């Protein structure tokens, strides 16, 4: 009843890579945009602020955002 969200550039990239039927890594900064069904099985590398982190997309992911899967904070221990 209101649109979900995804970055334009991201959307059309996924369009092209879907049509040409190859699995290529996608470096993206959109830490907001939702994972819509038509991207599943792709590998997307999301910006953690320094590095891109490769994530494999799955059936489960859909309905969340991208940034849930790239932890921004480096913490192990006191």
């Amino acid at each position: 009843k209101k649109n979900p969200f995804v970055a334009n550039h991201l959307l059309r990239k996924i369009e092209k890579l879907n049509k040409k039927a190859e699995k290529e890594i996608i470096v993206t900064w959109s830490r907001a945009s939702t994972i819509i069904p038509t991207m599943i099985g792709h590998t997307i590398a999301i910006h953690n602020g320094r590095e891109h982190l490769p994530i494999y997309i799955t059936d489960r992911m859909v309905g969340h955002k991208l940034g849930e899967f790239a932890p921004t904070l480096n913490f192990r221990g006191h």
Partner: peptide, 11 residues
């Protein structure tokens, strides 16, 4: 099912 769950909201 999270794909169809997503399509029931939007479609």
């Amino acid at each position: 099912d999270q794909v169809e769950k997503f399509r029931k909201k939007y479609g």
